[PDB]
């Protein structure tokens, strides 16, 4: 992701 935080795609 460019500008989000999270888990692996």
């Amino acid at each position: 992701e460019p500008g989000e935080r999270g888990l692996k795609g």
Partner: antibody
Amino acid sequence: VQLEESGPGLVRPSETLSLSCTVSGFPMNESYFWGWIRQSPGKGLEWLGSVIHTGTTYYRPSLESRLTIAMDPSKNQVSLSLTSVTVADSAMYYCVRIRGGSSNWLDPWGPGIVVTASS
Amino acid sequence: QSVWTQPPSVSAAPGQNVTISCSDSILRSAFVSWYQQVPGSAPKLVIFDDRQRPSGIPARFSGSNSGTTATLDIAGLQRGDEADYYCAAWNGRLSAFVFGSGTKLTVLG
């Protein structure tokens, strides 16, 4: 790429903790989150939250309602505001540059600033 | 979990190999990072995206992230390796960035 924390070393319980971080030798224009970690004396690291230049902001849920992390790219600064401080908020506070998405790595770190919360 | 589980203490003579664990399979779901802290300095990134080393971090530092336990592996242990090591990873369940409990690595003198 040097991050530097600045602000008061002593804060009074019930008042607001306000820290500032200056960024040198890197534009804040770029695809990075800027954030804050704290560490109580001989306890662990605790992620407070982070912000990107698009205004998106992530927070520790249990502190989310007391926490304000803001950045101004033009000043090369990132701010932290923590309201209603208690004796529990005594910590070293560190500014971090964060790669976002799935990665979530923190590099570099600022030297840190000691904050004592007492009346 | 709100804090990842790490052993509080790991220790070995200079030259030995050591493993530091970080604990459903929610770890396999995110990229694990590892941080070295010596007293009176800020944490330093030592492993990112499970496995990768930033610049200046020699090859005897490596990391794995299988389901249940992400590891930090150090071969050829040196006195200068003596520090607190913290794993870190996103918990999409809590939707927060979580650190581990921290491990003190002692190089036995």
